[PDB]
Amino acid sequence: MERYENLFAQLNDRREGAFVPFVTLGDPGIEQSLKIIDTLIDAGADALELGVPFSDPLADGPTIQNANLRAFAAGVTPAQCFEMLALIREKHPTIPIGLLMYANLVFNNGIDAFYARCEQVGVDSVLVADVPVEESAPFRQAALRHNIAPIFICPPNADDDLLRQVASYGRGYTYLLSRSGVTGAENRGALPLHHLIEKLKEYHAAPALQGFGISSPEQVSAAVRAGAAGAISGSAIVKIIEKNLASPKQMLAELRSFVSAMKAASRA
Amino acid sequence: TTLLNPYFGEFGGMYVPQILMPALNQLEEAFVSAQKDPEFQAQFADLLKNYAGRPTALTKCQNITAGTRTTLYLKREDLLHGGAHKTNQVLGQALLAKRMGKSEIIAETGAGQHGVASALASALLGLKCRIYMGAKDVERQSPNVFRMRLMGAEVIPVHSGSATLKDACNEALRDWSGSYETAHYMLGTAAGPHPYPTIVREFQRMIGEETKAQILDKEGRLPDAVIACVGGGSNAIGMFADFINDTSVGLIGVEPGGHGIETGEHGAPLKHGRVGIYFGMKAPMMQTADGQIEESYSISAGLDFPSVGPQHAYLNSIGRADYVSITDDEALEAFKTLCRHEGIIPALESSHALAHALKMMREQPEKEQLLVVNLSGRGDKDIFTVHDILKARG
Ligand SMILES: O=P(O)(O)OCCNS(=O)(=O)c1ccc(OC(F)(F)F)cc1
Ligand SMILES: C=C(/N=C/c1c(COP(=O)(O)O)cnc(C)c1O)C(=O)O
Numbered sequence: 173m174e175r176y177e178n179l180f181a182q183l184n185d186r187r188e189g190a191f192v193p194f195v196t197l198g199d200p201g202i203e204q205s206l207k208i209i210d211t212l213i214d215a216g217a218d219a220l221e222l223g224v225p226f227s228d229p230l231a232d233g234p235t236i237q238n239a240n241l242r243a244f245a246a247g248v249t250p251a252q253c254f255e256m257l258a259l260i261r262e263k264h265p266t267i268p269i270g271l272l273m274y275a276n277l278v279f280n281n282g283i284d285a286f287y288a289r290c291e292q293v294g295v296d297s298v299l300v301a302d303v304p305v306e307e308s309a310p311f312r313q314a315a316l317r318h319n320i321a322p323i324f325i326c327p328p329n330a331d332d333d334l335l336r337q338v339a340s341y342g343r344g345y346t347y348l349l350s351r352s353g354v355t356g357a358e359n360r361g362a363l364p365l366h367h368l369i370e371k372l373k374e375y376h377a378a379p380a381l382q383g384f385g386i387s388s389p390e391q392v393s394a395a396v397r398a399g400a401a402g403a404i405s406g407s408a409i410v411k412i413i414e415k416n417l418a419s420p421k422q423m424l425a426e427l428r429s430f431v432s433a434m435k436a437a438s439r440a
Numbered sequence: 441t442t443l444l445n446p447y448f449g450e451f452g453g454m455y456v457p458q459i460l461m462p463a464l465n466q467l468e469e470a471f472v473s474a475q476k477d478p479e480f481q482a483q484f485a486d487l488l489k490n491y492a493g494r495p496t497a498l499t500k501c502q503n504i505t506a507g508t509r510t511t512l513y514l515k516r517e518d519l520l521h522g523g524a525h526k527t528n529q530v531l532g533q534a535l536l537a538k539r540m541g542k543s544e545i546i547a548e549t550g551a552g553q554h555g556v557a558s559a560l561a562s563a564l565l566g567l568k569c570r571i572y573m574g575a576k577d578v579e580r581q582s583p584n585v586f587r588m589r590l591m592g593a594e595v596i597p598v599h600s601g602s603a604t605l606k607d608a609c610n611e612a613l614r615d616w617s618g619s620y621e622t623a624h625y626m627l628g629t630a631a632g633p634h635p636y637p638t639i640v641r642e643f644q645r646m647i648g649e650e651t652k653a654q655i656l657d658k659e660g661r662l663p664d665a666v667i668a669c670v671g672g673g674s675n676a677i678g679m680f681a682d683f684i685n686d687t688s689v690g691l692i693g694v695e696p697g698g699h700g701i702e703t704g705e706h707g708a709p710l711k712h713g714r715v716g717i718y719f720g721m722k723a724p725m726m727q728t729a730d731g732q733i734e735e736s737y738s739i740s741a742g743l744d745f746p747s748v749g750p751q752h753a754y755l756n757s758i759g760r761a762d763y764v765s766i767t768d769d770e771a772l773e774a775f776k777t778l779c780r781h782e783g784i785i786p787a788l789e790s791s792h793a794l795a796h797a798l799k800m801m802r803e804q805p806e807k808e809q810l811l812v813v814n815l816s817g818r819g820d821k822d823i824f825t826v827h828d829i830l831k832a833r834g
């Protein structure tokens with residue numbers, strides 16, 4: 173399908189950036205998670221990044237580690253995440269859906285079968301966080317065979333040859349890291365270096381979404397001002413879940429209010 | 441692109457976030473340079489000899505093989521400064537850190553011998569050091585925690601997951617991924633992303649080199665087999681490496697069987713896991729049907745790890761090395777036997793290797809065999825654990 177391409181062309185016309193929340197599927201249970209996700213979309217999410225719970229999430233900080241642990245405490249498996257993704261797609265036919273995966277969950281019982289499953293449920297992209305471009309051949313091949321975009325990462329660390337590989341191998345969107353470290357809202361990243369955004373554009377890479385440490389509307393506006401196509405916020409959204417576990421109604425209300433404020437700031 | 445092969449057959453690789461690839465490439469380049477630099481080699485050899493106390497003895501057992509056709513030697517890594525083989529490759533990696541201009545060290549530890557090693561090397565060589573340790577291991581290996589702090593290292597308890605070595609490794613890598621500009625990650629086993637399995641092997645290979653010279657001197661022939669415990673794989677690959685091309689020499693690696701393989705409470709992924717991708721490498725690991733990483737178990741903290749280094753997975757695959765397991769109770773008997781009959785108190789990790797050699801002898805007592813066990817560490821750290829068991833045992 174062409175969901176990312178369609179989204180970006182539409183935002184471009186509207187003079188808008190994308191606002192993309194992340195949550196962990198199944199946090200804090202299957203039913204409430206589905207409600208959170210519909211809430212995120214109703215509140216103006218342009219795309220989704222959705223994490224599958226993983227036992228040892230080495231690119232994640234404590235907030236998202238505890239989101240993983242909540243889902244496991246609800247008994248959430250990858251199979252149940254796939255059930256959720258199918259239901260989410262059925263409700264929302266055009267929103268681009270990206271997964272945040274760790275390699276072992278993709279490799280577990282077959283790389284090909286993993287991407288085939290993503291295609292079946294209507295996922296658009298997969299970002300495997302611990303597979304660098306150097307190791308990515310079997311992943312990108314399987315992704316493309318099943319009409320899934322493989323997402324690659326552009327660090328602030330990025331040299332030229334990496335820029336070119338990322339532009340060639342990646343599809344859908346290019347990920348722009350805000351900073352080194354792991355996910356977390358209490359570690360604020362830097363302004364998107366306008367060097368990389370320029371070079372990415374030069375090499376006709378998929379449009380960039382900046383991620384890590386984005387937790388405020390001011391940071392979303394800033395990413396767009398910097399030439400990025402959009403911004404991803406995970407820990408900030410997850411902390412609203414964490415704090416409202418005994419108040420699932422207030423949880424949703426707060427999610428709605430925050431997402432709306434973040435999306436409003438993406439309008440240029 | 442890399443200078444050296446990151447894989448051993450199908451195992452190994454560099455499965456880290458893209459952010460970390462420059463750090464790995466820089467480390468590999470520094471290591472390749474250092475390996476060909478006579479000054480680096482002289483500095484490393486000087487520290488090993490005059491600070492760490494190499495070469496270590498090879499001790500013939502006087503008493504435990506009586507009445508059999510086994511001749512058993514113990515490679516005395518328990519006599520190395522710090523009390524275990526971990527000291528060797530820390531001194532090399534600390535010198536690499538310096539060559540690269542890094543001023544801080546990160547390390548993980550289970551038994552606390554790598555943490556002790558990292559802190560002592562950091563004190564000697566003027567580096568600021570921080571050590572991750574699972575909260576469970578903080579407790580069962582507590583002599584080591586005190587040691588680390590006295591040497592000016594920060595020791596950080598990890599409460600996540602099993603609160604053991606795998607959890608310490610996770611936090612160490614989380615940390616490095618934010619701190620690599622100024623910190624070298626001093627990984628303490630022959631596992632993790634390339635180039636660590638290779639560097640750790642090369643910085644431990646004097647174990648086997650010495651063993652070979654010593655056994656030729658004393659016996660006039662190579663061993664029938666060399667036997668080493670396997671957690672992540674450093675002491676074992678250090679003993680094995682110089683013998684790999686000596687096809688007559690058996691290479692036997694011993695994983696922890698814990699309460700027994702059938703219980704699922706063990707640390708023997710090479711033989712009783714399946715291939716996965718975790719901690720920057722493709723390797724056998726203990727995992728759920730769905731590919732969540734399983735928590736391991738061993739009486740010994742150093743072996744309590746649900747993966748294994750990729751070179752061991754490769755040597756097993758081609759049949760060059762054989763891997764077996766030993767249970768907590770087998771390891772405890774070997775511990776007691778060595779204390780009582782040779783006056784050496786072995787680490788509970790090393791006791792697994794000894795227990796397998798004792799089985800090789802006892803099962804076939806008229807088989808002529810010349811064996812070396814890598815006595816990877818001393819068991820001072822374990823005396824409270826063994827006491828508490830042997831008491832509650834009656
Ligand atoms: O807002 P924060 O700080 O919580 O960050 C949320 C990020 N969520 S995500 O799925 O895009 C994401 C993307 C990449 C990650 O690792 C990698 F960069 F190495 F690939 C981890 C998470
Ligand atoms: C986990 C640790 N020690 C492991 C260890 C091991 C197992 O690790 P290797 O497989 O890397 O040798 C063997 N022998 C001794 C004395 C050990 O202390 C550590 O010190 O952090």
Ligand code: NA
Pocket residue numbers: 670671672695696707708709710745747748
């Ligand atoms: Na092992």
